[PDB]
Design a protein around this ligand. Sequence first.
Ligand SMILES: Nc1ncnc2c1ncn2[C@@H]1O[C@H](CSCC[C@H](N)C(=O)O)[C@@H](O)[C@H]1O
Lengths: 253, 121
Amino acid sequence: MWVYRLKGTLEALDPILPGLFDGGARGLWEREGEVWAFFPAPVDLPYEGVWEEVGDDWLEAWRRDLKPALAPPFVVLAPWHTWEGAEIPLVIEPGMAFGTGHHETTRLALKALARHLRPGDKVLDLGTGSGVLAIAAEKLGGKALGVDIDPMVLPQAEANAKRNGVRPRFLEGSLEAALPFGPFDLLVANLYAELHAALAPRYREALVPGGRALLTGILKDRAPLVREAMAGAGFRPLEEAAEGEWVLLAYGR
Amino acid sequence: KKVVAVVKLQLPAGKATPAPPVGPALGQHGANIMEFVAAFNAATANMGDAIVPVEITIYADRSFTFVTKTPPASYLIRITWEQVLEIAKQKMPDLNTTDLEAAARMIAGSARSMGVEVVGA
Ligand SMILES: Nc1ncnc2c1ncn2[C@@H]1O[C@H](CSCC[C@H](N)C(=O)O)[C@@H](O)[C@H]1O
């Protein structure tokens, strides 16, 4: 390809943007102080910009450096990955919902499910995103419910579920919406420190006596907010796990 | 959902491909460019020939999200008398100065030199 490089932001260059297309551009990319317009070949423009030819896929460039995400006893695989090991495969294509498995919090949640989920448990996966944890819970023999306040991730979670041969409920909403489906034996919430702290008394309300709450999404420094709220709510602490800057705090109730 | 990047592209409806700009703009954060192509083309297989500003919000785990904005006055015309009082209410969720009538005159003035012709207020 060729690039026409123009100085300014899309909004500042607005007036002349249709001109660049008329000219034969395929796409505009706002970059630091410039708009890059992509063309097949140079074509001589009135717009005061400057041309660069650019290196020659991009398809086999993102794919190629994206690897199975190991979270024992699971591995999170994209559809084209292959795996020899004995890990339980969770097939999840990197798509438009968080929970592709390439984050610390997702992987700490997965490992924590293995340590806590007794066969038969009813599991509430609060903040389901790609549905990866609810799917993990069914793989472990638990009956799972994924809820998310964002309706856009739900068809995605259903589709990840279908590929992986399991069928957890998914519905729109939060804790409130989940309550008639419970109480639960296990709750796993990959969210963030403040949200948990606000939901603590209600995490209690959702769990049967004896159940566990596995909380993550929590930045290491923000952890006290959570240790505090959960202590307030009556929970008794279990292990903590960390990776990078994130913690998973487990609690029994 | 930790944000690593918010990419401002501008693209022809239905025409997104994995070639630049999409390839490198989302490729460099390791977002599935293919999902984006197919998703962006699906949500705009509609708008015919237009030019769609789209923000892509890429997250820490390589997943992303995308919002399309509404296209320019220009295409959004295709002369005309006053019905810009019918585009200038199909401009707002499409513009920036809820002066309802502060658009009309702008769009119109513009509308004209397009130039599709006048009969307005
Ligand atoms: N108050 C709330 N109730 C339910 N879901 C919420 C929520 N606030 C945020 N969410 C959802 O929570 C998700 C956190 S991303 C975590 C996704 C996935 N469970 C994983 O472990 O990788 C997002 O999809 C967001 O939509």
